[PDB]
Scaffold this active site. Structure first.
Site, PDB file in Angstrom:
ATOM      1  N   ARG A  88     -13.711  -5.670   3.355  1.00 34.00           N
ATOM      2  CA  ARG A  88     -12.593  -5.446   4.278  1.00 34.00           C
ATOM      3  C   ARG A  88     -12.947  -5.659   5.751  1.00 34.00           C
ATOM      4  O   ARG A  88     -12.099  -5.538   6.629  1.00 34.00           O
ATOM      5  CB  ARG A  88     -12.088  -4.017   4.103  1.00 34.00           C
ATOM      6  CG  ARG A  88     -11.512  -3.727   2.727  1.00 34.00           C
ATOM      7  CD  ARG A  88     -10.018  -3.949   2.713  1.00 34.00           C
ATOM      8  NE  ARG A  88      -9.356  -2.974   3.555  1.00 34.00           N
ATOM      9  CZ  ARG A  88      -8.263  -3.192   4.285  1.00 34.00           C
ATOM     10  NH1 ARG A  88      -7.662  -4.380   4.317  1.00 34.00           N
ATOM     11  NH2 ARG A  88      -7.773  -2.200   5.007  1.00 34.00           N
ATOM     12  N   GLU A 132      -9.263   1.893  -1.955  1.00 36.34           N
ATOM     13  CA  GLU A 132      -9.995   1.527  -0.737  1.00 36.34           C
ATOM     14  C   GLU A 132     -10.722   2.708  -0.070  1.00 36.34           C
ATOM     15  O   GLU A 132     -10.209   3.824  -0.016  1.00 36.34           O
ATOM     16  CB  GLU A 132      -9.009   0.873   0.241  1.00 36.34           C
ATOM     17  CG  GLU A 132      -9.476   0.740   1.671  1.00 36.34           C
ATOM     18  CD  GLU A 132      -8.374   0.253   2.586  1.00 36.34           C
ATOM     19  OE1 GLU A 132      -8.606   0.238   3.805  1.00 36.34           O
ATOM     20  OE2 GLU A 132      -7.274  -0.110   2.099  1.00 36.34           O
ATOM     21  N   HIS A 184      -9.354   6.546   2.317  1.00 32.57           N
ATOM     22  CA  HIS A 184      -9.717   6.895   3.688  1.00 32.57           C
ATOM     23  C   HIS A 184     -10.870   7.905   3.823  1.00 32.57           C
ATOM     24  O   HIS A 184     -10.784   8.881   4.592  1.00 32.57           O
ATOM     25  CB  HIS A 184      -8.482   7.335   4.480  1.00 32.57           C
ATOM     26  CG  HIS A 184      -8.392   6.687   5.824  1.00 32.57           C
ATOM     27  ND1 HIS A 184      -8.758   7.332   6.986  1.00 32.57           N
ATOM     28  CD2 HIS A 184      -8.026   5.436   6.185  1.00 32.57           C
ATOM     29  CE1 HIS A 184      -8.589   6.515   8.010  1.00 32.57           C
ATOM     30  NE2 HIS A 184      -8.148   5.356   7.551  1.00 32.57           N
ATOM     31  N   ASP A 197      -5.278   3.613  -0.090  1.00 31.28           N
ATOM     32  CA  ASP A 197      -6.419   3.841   0.803  1.00 31.28           C
ATOM     33  C   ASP A 197      -6.817   5.319   0.731  1.00 31.28           C
ATOM     34  O   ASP A 197      -6.050   6.205   1.117  1.00 31.28           O
ATOM     35  CB  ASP A 197      -6.015   3.443   2.226  1.00 31.28           C
ATOM     36  CG  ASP A 197      -7.189   3.333   3.188  1.00 31.28           C
ATOM     37  OD1 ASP A 197      -8.279   3.898   2.949  1.00 31.28           O
ATOM     38  OD2 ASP A 197      -6.983   2.690   4.231  1.00 31.28           O
ATOM     39  N   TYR A 228      -3.699  11.232   5.523  1.00 26.97           N
ATOM     40  CA  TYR A 228      -3.829   9.891   6.060  1.00 26.97           C
ATOM     41  C   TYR A 228      -2.648   8.992   5.691  1.00 26.97           C
ATOM     42  O   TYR A 228      -2.187   8.978   4.543  1.00 26.97           O
ATOM     43  CB  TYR A 228      -5.114   9.200   5.598  1.00 26.97           C
ATOM     44  CG  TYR A 228      -5.044   7.742   5.964  1.00 26.97           C
ATOM     45  CD1 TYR A 228      -5.165   7.342   7.292  1.00 26.97           C
ATOM     46  CD2 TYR A 228      -4.779   6.767   5.001  1.00 26.97           C
ATOM     47  CE1 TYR A 228      -5.056   6.017   7.655  1.00 26.97           C
ATOM     48  CE2 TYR A 228      -4.668   5.431   5.360  1.00 26.97           C
ATOM     49  CZ  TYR A 228      -4.808   5.063   6.688  1.00 26.97           C
ATOM     50  OH  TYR A 228      -4.708   3.739   7.071  1.00 26.97           O
ATOM     51  N   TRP A 241     -12.136  11.529   8.572  1.00 19.09           N
ATOM     52  CA  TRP A 241     -10.735  11.168   8.710  1.00 19.09           C
ATOM     53  C   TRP A 241     -10.474   9.804   8.079  1.00 19.09           C
ATOM     54  O   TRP A 241     -11.261   8.859   8.236  1.00 19.09           O
ATOM     55  CB  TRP A 241     -10.294  11.154  10.176  1.00 19.09           C
ATOM     56  CG  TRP A 241      -8.881  10.680  10.291  1.00 19.09           C
ATOM     57  CD1 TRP A 241      -7.746  11.386   9.987  1.00 19.09           C
ATOM     58  CD2 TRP A 241      -8.448   9.380  10.693  1.00 19.09           C
ATOM     59  NE1 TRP A 241      -6.636  10.606  10.189  1.00 19.09           N
ATOM     60  CE2 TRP A 241      -7.036   9.365  10.613  1.00 19.09           C
ATOM     61  CE3 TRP A 241      -9.114   8.222  11.113  1.00 19.09           C
ATOM     62  CZ2 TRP A 241      -6.282   8.244  10.949  1.00 19.09           C
ATOM     63  CZ3 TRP A 241      -8.360   7.104  11.446  1.00 19.09           C
ATOM     64  CH2 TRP A 241      -6.957   7.125  11.355  1.00 19.09           C
ATOM     65  N   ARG A 261       0.854  -1.177   0.000  1.00 18.20           N
ATOM     66  CA  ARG A 261       0.000   0.000   0.000  1.00 18.20           C
ATOM     67  C   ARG A 261       0.894   1.232   0.000  1.00 18.20           C
ATOM     68  O   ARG A 261       1.840   1.302   0.776  1.00 18.20           O
ATOM     69  CB  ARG A 261      -0.906   0.018   1.224  1.00 18.20           C
ATOM     70  CG  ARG A 261      -1.951   1.102   1.147  1.00 18.20           C
ATOM     71  CD  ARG A 261      -2.728   1.211   2.437  1.00 18.20           C
ATOM     72  NE  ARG A 261      -2.008   1.969   3.454  1.00 18.20           N
ATOM     73  CZ  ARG A 261      -2.584   2.416   4.568  1.00 18.20           C
ATOM     74  NH1 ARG A 261      -3.875   2.169   4.789  1.00 18.20           N
ATOM     75  NH2 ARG A 261      -1.882   3.113   5.454  1.00 18.20           N
ATOM     76  N   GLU A 315     -13.798  -1.742   6.266  1.00 18.80           N
ATOM     77  CA  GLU A 315     -13.173  -1.856   7.586  1.00 18.80           C
ATOM     78  C   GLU A 315     -14.012  -1.221   8.700  1.00 18.80           C
ATOM     79  O   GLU A 315     -13.919  -1.648   9.846  1.00 18.80           O
ATOM     80  CB  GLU A 315     -11.754  -1.276   7.591  1.00 18.80           C
ATOM     81  CG  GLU A 315     -11.702   0.235   7.679  1.00 18.80           C
ATOM     82  CD  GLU A 315     -10.309   0.782   7.477  1.00 18.80           C
ATOM     83  OE1 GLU A 315      -9.684   0.391   6.476  1.00 18.80           O
ATOM     84  OE2 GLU A 315      -9.850   1.618   8.290  1.00 18.80           O
ATOM     85  N   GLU A 338      -4.007  -7.798   5.000  1.00 22.32           N
ATOM     86  CA  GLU A 338      -3.214  -6.668   5.456  1.00 22.32           C
ATOM     87  C   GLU A 338      -2.292  -7.086   6.597  1.00 22.32           C
ATOM     88  O   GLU A 338      -2.703  -7.828   7.498  1.00 22.32           O
ATOM     89  CB  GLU A 338      -4.148  -5.552   5.933  1.00 22.32           C
ATOM     90  CG  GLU A 338      -3.441  -4.311   6.437  1.00 22.32           C
ATOM     91  CD  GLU A 338      -4.419  -3.180   6.704  1.00 22.32           C
ATOM     92  OE1 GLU A 338      -5.640  -3.452   6.789  1.00 22.32           O
ATOM     93  OE2 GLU A 338      -3.969  -2.022   6.825  1.00 22.32           O
TER      94      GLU A 338
HETATM   95 MG   LIG Z   1      -8.154   1.481   5.445  1.00 20.06          MG
END
Ligand SMILES: [Mg+2]
Ligand SMILES: [Mg+2]
Lengths: 384, 396
Positions: B277, B230, B206, B204, B159, B396, B147, B256, B333
């Protein structure tokens, strides 16, 4: 109006309540209900350990910013514990803002849309006859609306109940027939299915009870999958209510937009407070859906007072559930809302009109109490 | 065999972890991860006060019944605190079941579907050049996938540029979408230029974009063939993914922050994502995640379990077992834990040549050393918040 203190109070004046208090540098304070029945200490910890410390020094006037800060900032979004914590903060901040404005909350929201707030009472009995006795009793007390429930013939830690859907489906319509026979057509009659049916079973029940013109049939089926309502709506014209177990507009956006329900039941304490519920009610209004806030004893007088204020302003008001609190609970939470002739009247005191007697609250320590669970006759863990 | 005891352990060997331990009348025991980063004590209380007392005396073998009892029985369904508590119980019960069966968890689940489980590493830096340096060093370690995240010029903090919960109260970051969108494709172009096409490259987003912004980013990065893009957009409204999917062929990953199959049923059935995820400790454990993975498989969606430092080695071990069996595995991950953390949670999973290997010990292969755990007291740490340049509280 910077926050100088914020803390929870846990008290059990007949049952558990958790309350958040926020105090500003100026001395003005607000309170919000944080009670999540059977999981109370999860919210207490969420608030005490993770939210309260971040409130100190924040501008209490920034209600929207604080809501987004806690909602988005938690990272893990939505959920009963999460949204109750956020609701408690939000309710306390609206309390503070109304006080600062010198207005009762309904005025700050946009003023009154109605002169009083219609309620319904719970009428329960072992037999149909027992239930009818309770209906007569509540009609005499001035209630224009009653929720009716009766036993099905043949039927600290969570109590274990046993359930038969098929026996309930055959029996329930007889209760409503009997209510209409004895009390006539003018009474509003509600019924709570309490999550126990599948959609086609609820469709069947809805059709069966059409002749009795229920005000609503509530919580027919578990609705994490919102499409669960579709078959019911396509098969019956009995009005439908749902949502006391929801905490987010995202739990009900599709229910509302597809016109699968008539009443949304998510209350202030569990639905992220005034800030969030205004948005839910407004979305509902576009589709002729009305509010029917969950109003059990396990929402405190803080929620009830704020709800009565909200009920007084909101254009698409439906009804307000009333389960009277104990005298001890009313003493712990002094308030200026009134109940008269089957209706609530909003208070005129600035704020939501509810306070907490902290010294008195401390005399009623927490006592663990869990909600029941329901099993089928073969032992299958079902929906209570 | 009935549950004799059940309790939580809270420890901070580099960062906070909450663990549930369940002990049967015979003395056999199992553990499950209960860690919810930045809200840890809400889960601890949920378990301590409301779940643990109801576990005493239950048949430990009744995994499904216990899962339903806690999920339906709570009355208030779903949510991060709720489902993490339930996941902790579930993971501990599968641990016990596998031990009773005398098998490593992957065997209990249906046996191995692969001989090793591919991972990806985090490569980050202030400048693109700094990031490329990190890619180089991870390739050297044998990672087949990385990543990549780098700073955005004109933005102080972004991020992934690393232990996110690094303050008692939330740190406040500032964000510019437009600067990020113009800069991000440059990173991927640089990674491909230096390292070629065989490397798997992940990114990502984010949560910071709107759907049409993510559509634009997806299209812009097609030439670089990312393994996934992602968390493009907040997805409480699952329809948020539709515009992205209709405008780009860059593969998409999400979830996630989810805790329920009901958070992603539509994303999956409408084919709006390529990787799901949601991990074991936040997604209701093995019992629930088997169901999510199986739904995903009908639509060619693969697993990509979130695997940050804030999921303990208990989750990682169980995840590696899961990853070893599940047909539609995508990637795992890997964010290495501290030495102190690995010591508190002895385990038999292994990392070799960029891949995990599942343990062979009965159970999920992870234990907790309670005496060692006791040496590291809880220390509050919160995730940051992100604000736009005008002060708007953002994602965030
Ligand atoms: Mg993530
Ligand atoms: Mg109800």
């Amino acid at each position: 109006l910077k926050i100088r203190d914020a803390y929870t109070i846990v008290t059990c004046p007949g049952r558990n309540f958790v309350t958040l208090k926020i105090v500003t540098e100026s001395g003005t304070h607000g309170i919000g209900d944080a009670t999540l029945n059977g999981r109370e200490m999860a919210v207490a910890a969420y608030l005490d350990e993770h939210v309260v410390p971040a409130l100190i020094g924040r501008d209490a006037g920034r209600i929207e910013d604080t809501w987004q800060y806690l909602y988005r900032g938690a990272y893990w979004r939505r959920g009963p514990v999460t949204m109750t914590a956020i609701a408690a903060v939000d309710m306390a901040l609206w309390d503070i803002k109304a006080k600062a404005a010198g207005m009762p909350l309904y005025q700050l929201l946009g003023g009154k849309s109605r002169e009083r707030v219609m309620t319904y009472a719970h009428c329960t009995g072992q037999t149909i006859e027992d239930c009818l006795g309770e209906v007569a009793r509540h009609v005499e007390l001035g209630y224009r609306a009653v929720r009716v429930q009766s036993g099905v013939p043949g039927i600290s830690l969570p109590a274990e109940h046993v359930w038969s859907t098929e026996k309930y489906l055959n029996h329930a319509p007889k209760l409503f027939a009997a209510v209409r026979e004895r009390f006539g057509d003018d009474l509003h009659v509600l019924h709570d299915v309490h999550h126990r049916l599948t959609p086609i079973e609820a469709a069947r029940l809805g059709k069966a009870v059409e002749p009795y013109h229920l005000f609503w049939l509530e919580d027919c089926v578990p609705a994490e999958n919102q499409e669960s309502l579709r078959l019911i709506r396509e098969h019956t014209t009995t009005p439908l209510a749902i949502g006391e177990v929801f905490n987010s507009i995202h739990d009900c956006r599709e229910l509302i937009q597809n016109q699968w329900i008539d009443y949304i039941r998510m209350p202030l304490t569990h639905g992220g407070g005034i800030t969030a519920m205004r948005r839910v009610a407004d979305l509902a209004s576009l589709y002729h859906v009305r509010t029917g806030f969950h109003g059990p004893t396990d929402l405190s007088p803080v929620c009830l007072g704020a709800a009565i204020h909200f009920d007084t302003w909101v254009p698409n008001f439906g009804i307000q559930e009333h389960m009277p609190h104990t005298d001890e609970t009313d003493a712990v939470f002094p308030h200026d809302y009134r109940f008269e002739d089957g209706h609530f009247l909003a208070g005129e005191s600035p704020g939501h009109g509810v306070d907490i007697d902290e010294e008195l609250a401390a005399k009623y320590p927490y006592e663990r109490a869990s909600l029941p669970v329901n099993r089928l006759e073969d032992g299958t863990l079902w929906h209570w």
